[PDB]
């Protein structure tokens, strides 16, 4: 069981997203380092691991790299069909405080950032039900993502014994 | 005229779907919400590495009898 995120399998489902639906329990693996439920979570959980130091401000930074990435790839963007807005309406409402970031943010930092983002999804449980993955790294050098619930997301950290 | 596809979803289920090939994407998704219950302007439904439109129907995506198509959906967002 020690080397079990060695053995994940990722699928490409469209360019550059990858999906895995391995059977393990997140805090088995993963530090979770919890974010305020403030609508802003998305972008506090990116910020604890790619920002040192980080506080309850470094999301403003992170949600300013998602509009320079928007600007960049929004149009483009699969998801961003189904949130029907133009660039500019998006950028207004995405920058908006306490508006929910999604898949779709998750997208658009990976490739502005250079980094490869894994939104690890469960239900009510430690169980995993899905991961998904935005760019080609592995899970060694991804920022893990913990969705629960609806909106929720929360920091992961691979556990030390692992690495 | 009808058929059935495979729907592998996000959480790892497949689901088969009673289709025919002039229904239209957002039919297909109605159906996906009467069995999953996933809303459909949450749904990504995706066949061989293209994410299908609504007013298109199967025929136009060359979806056949027995394809399998992915189902992803948003985590997050308004
Ligand atoms: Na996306
Ligand atoms: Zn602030």
Same mark, same amino acid.
């Given at each position: ?28 693996y ?26 309850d ?9 998602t ?11 699969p998801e961003?069909?189904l ?8 950028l ?14 998750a ?5 502005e ?11 009510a449980?430690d169980?995993?039900?899905?991961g ?9 050098t ?16 691979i556990?030390?014994?692992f690495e | %005229? #009808?058929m059935? @596809?495979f ?12 289709? &025919?090939?002039?229904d !239209?994407i957002?039919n ?5 919400? %009467? #069995?999953?219950g @996933?809303?459909?302007d ?6 061989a590495?293209?994410?299908? &439109?609504?007013?298109? !129907? ?11 198509l ?8 308004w």
């Amino acid at each position: 069981s020690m080397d079990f995120l060695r053995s994940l399998d990722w699928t490409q489902v469209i360019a550059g997203q990858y999906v895995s639906n391995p059977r393990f329990n997140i805090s088995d693996y993963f530090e979770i380092v919890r974010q305020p439920g403030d609508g802003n979570c998305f972008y506090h959980s990116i910020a604890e691991l790619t920002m040192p130091n980080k506080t309850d401000h470094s999301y403003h930074y992170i949600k300013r790299l998602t509009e320079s990435a928007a600007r960049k790839y929004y149009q483009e963007e699969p998801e961003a069909r189904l949130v029907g807005l133009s660039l500019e309406d998006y950028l207004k409402r995405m920058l908006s405080d306490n508006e929910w970031g999604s898949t779709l943010e998750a997208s658009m930092l990976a490739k502005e950032m250079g980094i490869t983002i894994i939104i690890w999804t469960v239900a009510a449980s430690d169980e995993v039900e899905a991961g998904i993955k935005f760019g080609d790294g592995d899970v060694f050098t991804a920022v893990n993502l913990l969705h629960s619930g609806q909106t929720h997301f929360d920091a992961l950290r691979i556990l030390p014994q692992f690495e | %005229d #009808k058929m059935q @596809i495979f729907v592998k979803t996000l959480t790892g289920k497949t689901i088969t779907l009673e289709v &025919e090939p002039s229904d !239209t994407i957002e039919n297909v998704k109605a159906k996906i919400q %009467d #069995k999953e219950g @996933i809303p459909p302007d949450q749904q990504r439904l995706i066949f061989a590495g293209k994410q299908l &439109e609504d007013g298109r !129907t199967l025929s136009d995506y060359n979806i056949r009898k027995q394809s399998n198509l992915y189902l992803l959906w948003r985590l997050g967002g308004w």
